[PDB]
Amino acid sequence: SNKKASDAEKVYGECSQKGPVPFSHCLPTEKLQRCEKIGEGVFGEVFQTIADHTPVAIKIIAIEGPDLVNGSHQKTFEEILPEIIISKELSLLSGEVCNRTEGFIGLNSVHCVQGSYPPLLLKAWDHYNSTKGSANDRPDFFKDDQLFIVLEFEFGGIDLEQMRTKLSSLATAKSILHQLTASLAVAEASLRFEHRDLHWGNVLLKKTSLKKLHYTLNGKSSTIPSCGLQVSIIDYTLSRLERDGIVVFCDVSMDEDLFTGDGDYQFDIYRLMKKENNNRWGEYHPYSNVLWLHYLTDKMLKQMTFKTKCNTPAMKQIKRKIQEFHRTMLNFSSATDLLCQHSLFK
């Protein structure tokens, strides 16, 4: 009873709140009217809107209620806290010094709101269902006492799956892999971070006019050619990190459906991660980052259509090097080991 109250105070404190606020304090009429649904998961819904002439992405998660939502029970205050903490910590890495990366996504704000679902969001939900189709329950059954966590992120671009046919050349592919590896290495070094769910819908790409991107790993600064794209890694629902010996993580040791999926290499990775940590998810195993990078390199080699010329000796050489990376990267222990020791990045 007191533990439930402690869990609640921790979440409200992360939100700079004393208690829940109404949906309006957070999504007033104008912002609601500009919402469009852009994604979904068992977790809930993601909308795109505009806040002060800037695009933002808003993730809405029902918490603490008894109803089934998209086939699963809602997370409690205790269970939602890790995603909040991790989103905050990875957003900070863009402004750090010794371990600095722009490769995650900025978190503008996080709120705990109370109310039934806004009709305007239901209308956006319906439009998505009509056009793209939806696996989720229409979220119209929540009562006016229902709590939600509302995470407002910087808008990070289009996901790698939807950019399948839009990359210019194999040079762009190598830059994307280099950006992902460097971002994960910086998070390993700073926070002993594992993403644990880096499928290609969680890799976003935005056009940039910067020719060189920068990161700093343990005080050493390096550059990566942008090839006109800036990568952002998103969605920390399953992630793990630690600060001063205190681990923050998603405890999936009683979750069964996560390890029974089929039809994609993605679902073999959950089973391999479980095998390698003996189902002890607080432990640090940065090899899981390598597994996800390996899955992403497979996508790069098998699913991408390029706009520019592929038969030039230079591009054929890049392809050979990404193939060699694909067949050797599993012999490295971490993203940091890949970044610093793999020949692809030399």
Ligand SMILES: CC1(N)CCN(c2nn3c(-c4ccc(F)cc4F)cnc3s2)CC1
């Ligand atoms: C269909 C999809 N794979 C691409 C479009 N899509 C987008 N989601 N986000 C986010 C974002 C979302 C969730 C989150 F936990 C953190 C975030 F930062 C930021 N910018 C964008 S585009 C939804 C997923």
